[PDB]
Structure 1
């Protein structure tokens, strides 16, 4: 398997990147009967899902990693077979309602309500139990729920709290409505420091010999990962296999292709500011959108690449960030992203000229 999954902490004691967070998780798992609904939020790739699985392993014991995929089928108002994969475990369930689109309301209203209605009585056990009495449902990407699946959950996880518990993983919990955040215990997961990422990469290159020339090459990957442990571990494997398992100080850091294309677009915007350049930028944006890359991330990386240009004055950057905020708000409240993604670029070139 990939080094991101192979070297994954499978227990609460194997976590080694945040210790004030691991202690809070141990405090939560000490008495699992009264565990409230949890909402883990933080940057992407910090280890939020790994920590959720480690907490579930501390609560229900080993075996929560024995995952099987049970394909479900749903029908909306106008008869149409809509399919959702449900990765399930003998003690917990993982669902991604965002994968089915705007119709995640029917998934939340049927699957989650049917799970929350089954008491999970098992053999007797009608009094209580630390495990196997209540159930854990993991809702990955809680941010992409379309404000109606979040309304069907407010009473679902409140009335049926005795037989079900929810642990939802999310980043930047702004599009999560206030009633959902009120019913839940907010758990902040900070990103690992560069020293911690370097230590984890050192452990990886110790278990698998890649012949590290200098400890600085692991630090460069950590600084290029911007706090993303999964990305850092992916670039480690990339520069490992692309250099015959021998990392040198001159080894280039491999970055995603869409990031390079966004940087090229930024340089084109800085160099050429005209209508035809705007049309070429629209072609680049369409090509980027054809790869199912979300438009908010396109705008975010484009803005933070334009703010890194050394030939731009402070007045230009203060206008770029303002246009970025305005068009991000427009993109959030919109249907088609090309209009806003082109308007931001047009205003940027109209300001830089």
Structure 2
């Protein structure tokens, strides 16, 4: 398996990148009977899902990591048969309503309502009494599945509990946030990522030459542990079980494509350059990369150019904010992704 999964912490005592948060999780799990609904928010890849699974182990004992997949099908308002993968555990449940699209409403109103209606009592029943359902990517719920959750998890909370993992809580409506306990998961420092990578290379044979390259991995990952371990394995496979200080820090292909787009924008500012930028943006979108991420990375690559003055960067960030707001309240992403670029190269000239 991958080094992100093979070395995944499988308990609350195995966490080693945030201790205040681990103490808080232990405090929550000491008395599991009055556990409220929890909303874990923080940067991507900090270990929010790992912390949730550790908490579920701590509350329901070992038994929560034995996942198996259930195929569950619905039908939209019209006769549109739909499928959703449901990975389930003897003590908890996990679904990703965002994977089905704008029709997560039927999923929330049928699957979750059915599980919340069942009492789970087994001959006069914390452990296999209430149920825990994990909503992965709670940000992508389309402002309506969050409305169907306001009463589902407030009326049937005696036999079900909700713990949702979301990076950021801007797209989550106020009523949903009000009913839940907010748990913040800060990103680990570079020293902690270096320590984790050192442990991995100690249990592995990557044959490090200097422990200042693990620091380079940590700095290049921008606080993302999954990405850090992915680069570690990448270099420790392309460069053999050997990591020299000359080894190349591997970055995702879409990132370097966005950097090339940035350099093209800075160099060439003309209508034909705009059309080629559109072609590259279409190629990026053809890989199912979300448009907000494309805009964010493009903006933060444009702000990294050393040949731009402060006024150009301020204009770039203002246009980025305006077009991010437009993208949020929009249907087609290409219009806004093109408008941002057009304004950028109309300002740099």
Work out whether the TM-score is over 0.5.
yes
Name 2:100's counterpart in structure 1: 100
Q: Secondary structure at the match of 2:69?
A: strand
**For structure 1, which runs of at least 5 residues remain unmatched after alignment?**
126-130
Task: Tell me the CA shift for residue 5 of structure 1.
Answer: 0.3
Deviation at 1:117, TM superposition (A): 0.1
CA shift digits 1:170-228 (9 cap, x unpaired): 01110000000000000000000000000000000000111100000100000000000
With structure 1 as the length reference, what TM-score do the two structures score? 0.98
Distance apart, 1:114 and its partner CA? 0.1
Residue 269 of structure 1 deviates from its aligned partner by 0.0
Partner of residue 194 from structure 2, selected from 165, 179, 198 = 198
TM-score by length of 2: 0.99
- Deviating above 6 A after TM superposition, structure 1's stretches of 4 or more consecutive aligned residues are none
SS class of match (1:165): strand
Count of matched residue positions in the alignment of Structure 1 and Structure 2: 348
Pick from 277, 289, 296 the counterpart of residue 293 of structure 1.
Answer: 289
What does residue 182 of structure 2 align with? Answer: 186
Whole-Å Cα distance in 2 between the matches of residues 335 and 259 of structure 1? 24
Q: Which moved more, 1:115-124 or 1:82-91?
A: 115-124
Q: Describe the SS at the equivalent of 1:343.
A: helix
State how far apart, in whole Å, the 2-side matches of 1:106 and 1:73 are: 10
- CA distance in 1: counterparts of 2:5 and 2:102, whole angstroms: 30
Query: In the TM superposition, what whole-angstrom CA distance separates every residue of 1:290-348 from its partner, at most 9, and x where no partner exists?
Result: 00000000000000000000000000000000000000000000000000000000000
1:124 Cα deviation (Å)?
2.3
Distance in 1, matches of 2:73 and 2:149, equals: 20
Distance 1:89 1:62 in 2: 11
Q: Secondary structure at the match of 1:22?
A: helix
SS at match of 2:321: helix
Q: CA deviation at 1:123?
A: 2.8
1:156 corresponds to which residue? 152
Mapped partners of 2:167, 2:174: distance in 1 = 15
Mapped partners of 2:27, 2:280: distance in 1: 49
Q: What secondary structure is seen at the aligned counterpart in 2 of 1:260? A: helix
SS at the partner of 2:145?
coil
CA distance in 2, matches of 1:327, 1:173: 20
Partners of 2:162 and 2:83 in 1: CA distance: 22
- Matched position secondary structure for 1:146: coil
Post-superposition shift, 1:80?
A: 1.4
Q: Is 2:344 the partner of 1:348?
A: yes
- Aligned-pair CA distance for 1:78: 1.0
Name the Cα RMSD after superposition.
0.4
The Cα shift of 1:77 comes to: 1.4
Q: CA–CA distance in 2 between the matches of 1:145 and 1:124?
A: 36
* CA–CA separation in structure 2 for the residues paired with 1:123 and 1:251: 61
Distance in 2, matches of 1:233 and 1:76, equals 40
Matches of 1:208 and 1:122, distance apart in 2: 46
Residues in 1 aligned to 2:334 and 2:122: alpha-carbon distance in whole angstroms: 53
Cα deviation code 1:258-317 (max 9, x no counterpart):
000000000000000000000000000000000000000000000000000000000000
Distance 2:138 2:12 in 1: 23
Could you list the per-position Cα deviations for residues 102-123 of structure 1 after superposition, in whole angstroms to 9, with x for gaps in the alignment? 0000000000000000000123
Show CA shifts across 1:126-146 (max 9, x none): xxxxx1110000000000000
- Name the structure 1 match of 2:219: 223
Counterpart CA distance in 2 for 1:189 and 1:244 is 34
Q: Secondary structure at the match of 1:84?
A: strand
* Separation in 1, partners of 2:66, 2:79: 34
Query: Do structure 1's residue 140 and structure 2's residue 136 form an aligned pair?
Result: yes
Give CA deviations for 1:228-256 in whole Å, capped at 9, x if unaligned: 00000000000000011100000010000
State the 1:156 CA deviation.
0.3
In structure 2, runs of 5+ residues without a counterpart are none
Q: CA deviation at 1:81?
A: 1.1
Alignment correspondent of 1:128: none
